[PDB]
């Protein structure tokens, strides 16, 4: 398709905003390292102790 992306994989392009990816270990371009995890949430807040 006529779009913009610097990271290409057999599955299509994926945005490289994150540092890791779990789409394909085959990539070309500026791409997120591939890992086996489908998710890894980095805490960007303090602990939540609701009322």
């Amino acid at each position: 398709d006529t779009c913009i992306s610097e990271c290409i994989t057999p599955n299509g392009s994926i945005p490289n905003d994150k540092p890791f990816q779990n789409v394909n270990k085959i990539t070309y371009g500026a791409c997120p390292k591939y890992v086996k995890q489908n998710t890894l949430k980095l805490a960007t807040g303090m602990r939540n102790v609701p009322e």
């Binding site: 398709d1 006529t2 779009c3 913009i4 992306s5 610097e6 290409i8 994989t9 599955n11 299509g12 392009s13 994926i14 945005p15 490289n16 905003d17 994150k18 540092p19 890791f20 990816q21 779990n22 789409v23 070309y28 371009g29 997120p32 890992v35 995890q37 489908n38 998710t39 890894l40 949430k41 980095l42 805490a43 960007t44 807040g45 303090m46 602990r47 939540n48 102790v49 609701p50 009322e51």
Partner: protein, 102 residues
């Protein structure tokens, strides 16, 4: 006579479980996803020069199989070979096809 002053911090109704060194799941007020897990399915023609191989592998476009002559003198950043690309010329074989192709 007296006054009360209480120090404190915020909280949100619904938080996000995260993992730490000592806890499997611990609720925090916010989190960001570090793993990109989806694609659109499409490959983008920018900023990398993508050459769609159509029905041709790189080799048949290299040698000159009639139906690949449309690729004469082409250049690419990334050549995209299709699973169903086929040869329609004199039967050949390449000893060390992998390295020639690479």
């Amino acid at each position: 006579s007296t006054a009360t002053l209480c120090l404190g911090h915020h909280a949100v109704p619904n938080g996000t479980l995260v993992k730490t060194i000592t806890d499997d799941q611990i609720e925090v007020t916010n989190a960001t996803e570090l793993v990109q897990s989806s694609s659109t399915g499409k490959i983008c023609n920018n900023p990398h020069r993508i050459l769609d191989g159509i029905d041709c592998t790189l080799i048949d476009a290299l040698l000159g199989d009639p139906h690949c002559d449309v690729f004469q003198n082409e250049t690419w950043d990334l050549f995209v070979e299709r699973s169903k690309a086929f040869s329609n010329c004199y039967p050949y074989d390449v000893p060390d096809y992998a390295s020639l192709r690479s």
